[PDB]
Amino acid sequence: GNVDLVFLFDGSMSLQPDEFQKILDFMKDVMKKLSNTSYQFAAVQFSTSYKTEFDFSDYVKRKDPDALLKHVKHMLLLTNTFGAINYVATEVFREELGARPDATKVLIIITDGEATDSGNIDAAKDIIRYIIGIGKHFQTKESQETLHKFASKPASEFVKILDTFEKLKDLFTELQKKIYVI
Numbered sequence: 001g002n003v004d005l006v007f008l009f010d011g012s013m014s015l016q017p018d019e020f021q022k023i024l025d026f027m028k029d030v031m032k033k034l035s036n037t038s039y040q041f042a043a044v045q046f047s048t049s050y051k052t053e054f055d056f057s058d059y060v061k062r063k064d065p066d067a068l069l070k071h072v073k074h075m076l077l078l079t080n081t082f083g084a085i086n087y088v089a090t091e092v093f094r095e096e097l098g099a100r101p102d103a104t105k106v107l108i109i110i111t112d113g114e115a116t117d118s119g120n121i122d123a124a125k126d127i128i129r130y131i132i133g134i135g136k137h138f139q140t141k142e143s144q145e146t147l148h149k150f151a152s153k154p155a156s157e158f159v160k161i162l163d164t165f166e167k168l169k170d171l172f173t174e175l176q177k178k179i180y181v182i
Ligand SMILES: CN1C(=O)N(c2cc(Cl)cc(Cl)c2)C(=O)[C@]12CN(c1ccc(C(=O)O)cn1)C[C@H]2c1ccc(C#N)cc1
Pocket: 003, 030, 033, 104, 106, 108, 128, 130, 131, 132, 160, 175, 176, 178, 179
C-alpha cells in the first residue's frame, strides 16, 4: 500500500501572499493527516523553471511538514506545466531521491493558470495525475477543460476546479471522507 505522492504547485499569478499561503497550508494539512502511514511525500514548485522544495528522502528524515515548507519562496514568473510534469517524472520519481520502486506514483498538480508551454507528458504515463485549477483564470467551462489533458481519466474524478484559494480548506475536508486511516 505504499504511495509516493508529489505536490507540484504554481502560484505565480495569485500574487497575494494570503492566497499562496493557502496552497502551503493545504499540503501541510494532507501530510499531517497521513503522517506515519506508508505514504511518502515530495513537493516541487514551478513557474518558468522547477524547484524541488523537498524530496522523499528529506520527508523521511524530518517528517515535519512545517519544517519542510519553512523556506518556500513565492515564484512569480510563468506557468510551464508541461515542463514541470516532465521534471517530476524524470527528476523526482527517482530512487536516488528516496522514491520507492514498488510504490504507486501520484502527482497532485495545483495551478492558477493555463500552461505557458507545449509538449507532451508521455514520460508521466505511469503516474496517477490529479489537477486542481484555482481562481479567476478557470471561471469559464472552456478554461477548465484545458486542464483535462494533464490529468488522468476520467476528468470527473481527477480534475478539481475551485473558484477561490479559500476553498482549498473545504476540498481538504471533502478528501478526508474518502480515506480511512487505521
Ligand atoms: C481518491 N483520491 C483523491 O481524491 N486523491 C487526491 C486528490 C487530490 Cl485533488 C488531492 C489529494 Cl492530496 C489527493 C488521492 O490521492 C486519492 C487516490 N488515491 C489512490 C491510492 C492508491 C491508488 C492505487 O493503488 O492505484 C490509487 N489512488 C488515494 C486517494 C486519497 C484521498 C484523500 C487523501 C487526503 N487527504 C489522500 C489520498
